């Protein structure tokens, strides 16, 4: 080769292609969670709106990485998006615990993207990862921890009054 | 024949006359439910406002069917409106369960009105039933199911805090 | 039961339950009259709008009596609403004469409700009947008398120009 | 072939070409009626404005059918537009009776277009006919019936005061 | 089973689950096309904005079908989303031809969904398909046909002036 | 015749009846041209809007002549409107050339209407023709000549870029 490419390794190009697939898969998991809470035998509307907003954010993360790949001079290759591991999510506390578990994995993958970028002397890539992806994750993790603590203290999962009142007052 | 009548069978004319009576009877059942929740030993004001709104909607359904009957060239015949089957409604969950049971019967009657219109080659009547009466019913049924699920989970009927808080936050 | 009941007889409770049924029956009669004048071989739109307004007023009278019954500490019991005595109303002068005949009967029933209330020493009930129901009746009767006199003088019922011009200028 | 054609029969294509010609012919009949009522020995201005509005509506019906034909992938073929059957329309009641007679024929032709569409498994065409053409006809027929009834009752055609007052108050 | 389910077959439930997957796959194909036209050796910005808008529309179609599935009383099951068949799209006329080919397949699948709903006596489902999905498809097909015709006439693909001027003036 | 007729010959009455038919026929030719350019294998939207505007203007010319016939005291007689001579119009330059050829014929017919009015001593008719119909024609002819010259110079008909750019910039 490209006429705009300068100081961009092949390994970085492969790692960006893996992160794009990971973000699309997370967006699909959140979409499944959202429409579980819309059923007539679950019926909690603010849980549903919350997870639909999360699903709309992961997709913007993916599109931003695709724009970076085109700016630096590499080529995009897409893969299959696999289906989520759960079909029924069982409760409102259980979904929050699974969401925490997923955001920690995404954070762990970004940290290795950053160590690869520093092993190759690519300061533009290091600055991109630090500015756009690293503070957002620790904020999301802190919020999900707060939610899980409050739901455990109110008395869920073996109490429906707890999840009804949490649906009303926090979300 | 009448000078405006064209492609309108006698059987359709009798079935429309039966549906008008069914809508008037449903309006009278909702009016009974409403003023049960206004008594001084029940005293729940948002249950009462909710059922009064439902009562005002059924009467508009009936008047729309009468206008159709006059547009196509048939004649209206009215019958006696019978009294409701219950006098005391016992609880707030119990009334929602009876309301669900009533809306399902009205839906079942509309489906046979539609099969009769199809067996007779009357596309104007089929379009009227599909446009004005069929999506409204499935929406009403989905809402009443949501309400019953939430009230059962909060712990009603053997808990007064549940119905007090449901009166305040949902209705 | 009741904790709010004070100075309220059983006979008064039965008479209020009869007046509620009478008001619902009058509302049903006016609804029949209204949709007779909407047919394509009668076709007089302001007669129809006038009788539809009367039908919407009788129903509010009934709901106000139900609220009184709950305020004083009695219990509501509903009956069957019978069908009207006429199906075809024959003319525009004929319907006005039947309407006058019906309002006089309702007035006669209120006068006996008032004499019962005074025979029992119930001043709250006497004040309710005098304030909300007695001047409205004499005003409605005076108006229907005016209408009948004007229609007879213009030359109805054996003149269509008369009822066309009355539909247009007065109503 | 056409690159956009899918699930569209030749018979449907011929029937749409016949309906276009029928709508153009109806527009020409209404234009003749309009300018009859503008003569100095007839002189009724609101009859004339009413029939000119009807003439402007039939032409839009025809243009909408031509747009459908181009959307589905068929080809338009035009024919001769014949002249109306009457030159002098004789009265104001007589023109309304002829107008009713014409709208009933157009309705009868649309009903066979719909039965052809269902015999061929074309749901897009059935939905087009039901949504845009079938309720409009029954409304037009009900209105013309009202007009004819009122004019007969006022005493037309052997009374000029009747048609003068009807020209002034209804139209 | 469910407490809201009435007149809903198992076969319809399986067919809706297949249509959801088809809509998600179409959205992913459009997203691939969009970011091909953003490369530095292709560089056509209005082609890219056009295909990104199409990608955002398919996802709303899918979410609407999921809401229907929950309203009627069935259960959602998700599958893997496969990757697109092409990686490099070769030209601007070539992408429009592939887009036409895709929309025709989606239309063919909806027509069989409708024939299944008719063979089972489900008028609510038939009305849903006719109102929300069938006119939209024929409009999209007519537009893509227009685009392909204009690009072929201007002289593409063996002329860069053609696609530059089409990028500027139409899109 | 008539009580308002004065200085109006029978020959003038027949010539006005012929001009009305000529204007209706021109309106129908323009309507055919318009919907040829809407097909999916022609696809030029501003040619279509231009010819639809011309079609709406010819009909107003005809209605104005009918009003004059009623003002002077003659009687209107209508004939059959024949179908256009072409079905496929082949190109944009070709349609512009046919339009020029049609407007010249209409002008030639108006000039003989004027010579007839002068041979009969009818100054009101001469003033009508001069004020409302004669400058309009020479302006329309000058415009169509401009269009044909520009299209020939750009390189049509054997160049699609020419007609695409003329569609965009002039119309
Ligand atoms: Fe609270
Ligand atoms: Fe240009």
Curated annotation (Swiss-Prot), chains A, B, C, D, E, F:
GO cellular component term of the entry, any: cytosol
Keywords tagged on the record: Acetylation, Cytoplasm, Cytoplasmic vesicle, Iron, Iron storage, Lysosome, Metal-binding, Neurodegeneration, Oxidoreductase, Phosphoprotein
Expression across tissues: Expressed in the liver.
CDD domains per UniProt: Euk_Ferritin (cd01056)
PROSITE patterns membership: FERRITIN_1, FERRITIN_2, FERRITIN_LIKE
Main location: cytoplasm
Effect caused by changing residue 23 to A: Reduces iron binding and oxidation rate
Domain of life, per lineage: Eukaryota
Enzyme Commission identifier(s): 1.16.3.1
One MF annotation (Gene Ontology) recorded for this entry: identical protein binding
SUPFAM superfamilies: Ferritin-like
Record-listed Fe cation 1 binding positions: 23, 58, 61
Enzyme class: oxidoreductase
Catalytic activities: 4 Fe(2+) + O2 + 4 H(+) = 4 Fe(3+) + 2 H2O
Homology family: Belongs to the ferritin family.
Disease affiliated with this protein: Hemochromatosis 5: A disorder of iron metabolism characterized by iron overload. Excess iron is deposited in a variety of organs leading to their failure, and resulting in serious illnesses including cirrhosis, hepatomas, diabetes, cardiomyopathy, arthritis, and hypogonadotropic hypogonadism. Severe effects of the disease usually do not appear until after decades of progressive iron loading. Neurodegeneration with brain iron accumulation 9: An autosomal dominant neurodegenerative disorder associated with iron accumulation, primarily in the basal ganglia. It is characterized by global developmental delay apparent from infancy, and progressive decline of motor and cognitive skills. Clinical features include delayed walking or inability to walk, spasticity with hyperreflexia, ataxia, dystonia, and poor or absent language.
Annotated protein name in UniProt: Ferritin heavy chain
Origin species: Homo sapiens
Lineage of the species this protein comes from: Eukaryota, Metazoa, Chordata, Craniata, Vertebrata
Gene: FTH1
């Amino acid at each position: 080769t490209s006429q705009v490419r300068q100081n961009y390794h092949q390994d970085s190009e492969a790692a960006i292609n893996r992160q794009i697939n990971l973000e699309l898969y997370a967006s699909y998991v959140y979409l499944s969670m959202s429409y579980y809470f819309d059923r007539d035998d679950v019926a909690l509307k603010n849980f549903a709106k919350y997870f639909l907003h999360q699903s709309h954010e992961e997709r913007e993360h993916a599109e931003k990485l695709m724009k970076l790949q085109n700016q630096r001079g590499g080529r995009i290759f897409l893969q299959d998006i696999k289906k989520p591991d759960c079909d029924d999510w069982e409760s409102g506390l259980n979904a929050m615990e699974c969401a925490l578990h997923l955001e920690k994995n995404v954070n762990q993958s970004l940290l290795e993207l950053h160590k690869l970028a520093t092993d190759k002397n690519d300061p533009h890539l290091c600055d991109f990862i630090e500015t756009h992806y690293l503070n957002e994750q620790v904020k999301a993790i802190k919020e999900l921890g707060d939610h899980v603590t409050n739901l455990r203290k109110m008395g869920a999962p073996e109490s429906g009054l707890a999840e009804y009142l949490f649906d009303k007052h926090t979300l």
